Amino acid sequence: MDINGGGATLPQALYQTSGVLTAGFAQYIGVGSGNGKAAFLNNDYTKFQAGVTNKNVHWAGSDSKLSATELSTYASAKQPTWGKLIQVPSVGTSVAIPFNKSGSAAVDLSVQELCGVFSGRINTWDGISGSGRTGPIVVVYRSESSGTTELFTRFLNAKCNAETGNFAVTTTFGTSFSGGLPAGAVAATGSQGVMTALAAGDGRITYMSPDFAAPTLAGLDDATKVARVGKNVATNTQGVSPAAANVSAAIGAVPVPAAADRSNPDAWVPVFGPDNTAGVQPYPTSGYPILGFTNLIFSQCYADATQTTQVRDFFTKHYGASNNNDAAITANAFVPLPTAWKATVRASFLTASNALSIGNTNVCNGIGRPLL
Ligand SMILES: O=P([O-])([O-])O
């Protein structure tokens, strides 16, 4: 039986790049982070392929963290027979703001203008300073439980203090803002489904994976199509683009998971959040401001020996010092993890003597996610 994974659409083109997933891995299935988490946690392959029940789920991609309830339920129901789950960052990512509104002038949103567009306070292109554009704004958002939504609403939660209401951190944008969606907002499903909808009417704007936000990497720098973020007119300061190079310094400054906490999967996924708040990283003051991590969710243990080996071999590649996936990571508009981050992941999840290591012959002795 092949190893089956799926989930988050934000990075699905990375996991679909030839050679990124190693031997024994079936091609990755992009369904959204909420579906990916449910697939793994319940061993429910129908969350990957509706109507198909003759396969097991071995791993998920997610840009939404496992919640307290998700973690505790798995620990009590599954961990005794299947082993601990593993949650680890895969790559860093910006969150881009593509839009469909023609004109040669650059669209460069201040953070407060971004807040106002997504709250519905600013609902005309006239209301974005220096835009060269007029007429109505329609916001497009993700209908389903989305990790892109979680990454984006972390930023709005941290920055948007001057609305007639508050943005909550969530996977469902339709409930994020306490004052409701903007009038006329359009729901769509998946990263690609949102990009399709962006084009189905004039004057639309959204939040998006930096891969799907432009057909080519250079397109992220085209401010006629992908907004700059960070304008401040009063200081004569321009915003910048969501190109990976504009978030890579900040991703590199994120500390490794705290040693004494490494048995807690929540400790492994860094999140950005409000200033001067322990436990979250502040959004960066330089470069492009909207960023975070997309993650992997695996089991420590698999009943089958070959599958255990194949999962280890994937980690050996994805977190390797050499012969790794970093070139493919960059090609899909993402940020590779620092060399010290990779070493920390390997020390816990690969190195055999570690209590957390995949296939550990003592900890996994007799246990693991089932073959049949
Ligand atoms: O699809 P997502 O990645 O979850 O947003």
Side-chain angles (χ1 to χ4, degrees):
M1 283 325 86
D2 277 352
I3 296 298
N4 301 308
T9 71
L10 168 150
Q12 71 185 34
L14 168 61
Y15 301 137
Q16 295 163 358
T17 293
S18 193
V20 165
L21 307 179
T22 52
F25 279 65
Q27 293 307 294
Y28 182 83
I29 302 166
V31 288
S33 295
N35 283 320
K37 294 193 295 174
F40 179 89
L41 296 164
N42 302 289
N43 190 34
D44 180 6
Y45 193 84
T46 74
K47 300 292 151 147
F48 290 171
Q49 299 186 337
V52 181
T53 53
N54 65 346
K55 290 182 174 177
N56 293 302
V57 173
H58 302 93
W59 70 281
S62 185
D63 8 80
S64 169
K65 285 196 66 164
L66 289 162
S67 69
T69 302
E70 284 169 319
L71 290 170
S72 70
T73 298
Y74 193 85
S76 65
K78 304 305 195 184
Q79 178 177 319
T81 53
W82 291 359
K84 284 174 65 52
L85 66 75
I86 295 170
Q87 184 181 225
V88 283
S90 179
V91 306
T93 190
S94 62
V95 177
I97 307 300
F99 62 89
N100 176 28
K101 187 70 174 180
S102 68
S104 62
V107 174
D108 178 358
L109 291 164
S110 69
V111 170
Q112 290 307 304
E113 283 169 339
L114 177 83
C115 293
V117 168
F118 286 89
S119 74
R121 172 173 56 87
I122 297 173
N123 62 23
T124 65
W125 289 94
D126 314 61
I128 299 167
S129 68
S131 73
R133 290 155 166 79
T134 63
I137 302 173
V138 170
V139 171
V140 185
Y141 70 95
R142 290 283 293 283
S143 68
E144 80 286 37
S145 176
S146 163
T148 309
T149 296
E150 186 172 296
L151 291 177
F152 184 55
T153 64
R154 287 186 187 293
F155 182 79
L156 301 178
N157 170 264
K159 295 293 181 172
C160 302
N161 70 323
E163 304 305 317
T164 64
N166 306 314
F167 294 93
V169 181
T170 183
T171 71
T172 54
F173 185 79
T175 58
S176 177
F177 190 60
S178 67
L181 284 166
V186 175
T189 305
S191 293
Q192 298 163 289
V194 160
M195 292 303 293
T196 296
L198 199 73
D202 200 17
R204 292 181 179 198
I205 189 160
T206 194
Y207 57 93
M208 186 54 57
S209 170
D211 172 40
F212 292 106
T216 70
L217 290 176
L220 296 176
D221 293 315
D222 183 351
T224 79
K225 299 180 170 293
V226 176
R228 297 163 182 168
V229 180
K231 179 176 66 195
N232 182 337
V233 180
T235 70
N236 197 24
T237 299
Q238 291 204 326
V240 305
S241 79
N246 297 327
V247 294
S248 56
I251 291 298
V254 175
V256 302
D261 301 329
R262 285 174 188 158
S263 68
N264 183 352
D266 185 76
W268 279 87
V269 176
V271 301
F272 292 84
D275 294 347
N276 303 300
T277 305
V280 306
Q281 294 309 307
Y283 288 99
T285 56
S286 62
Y288 184 81
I290 323 178
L291 81 182
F293 293 87
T294 184
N295 316 306
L296 306 180
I297 301 165
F298 279 77
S299 187
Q300 186 181 351
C301 308
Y302 295 86
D304 185 63
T306 295
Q307 294 184 337
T308 295
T309 297
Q310 288 174 332
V311 168
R312 290 180 57 78
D313 292 343
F314 172 62
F315 274 68
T316 291
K317 184 166 200 181
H318 204 60
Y319 302 98
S322 287
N323 292 301
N324 66 40
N325 287 325
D326 289 358
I329 291 166
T330 70
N332 293 277
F334 304 126
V335 180
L337 301 183
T339 302
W341 256 98
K342 295 191 179 70
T344 300
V345 174
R346 297 197 307 273
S348 289
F349 302 118
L350 284 169
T351 302
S353 59
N354 201 281
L356 301 186
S357 68
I358 297 156
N360 177 310
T361 62
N362 299 302
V363 172
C364 298
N365 185 330
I367 66 171
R369 291 184 71 106
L371 181 50
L372 288 190

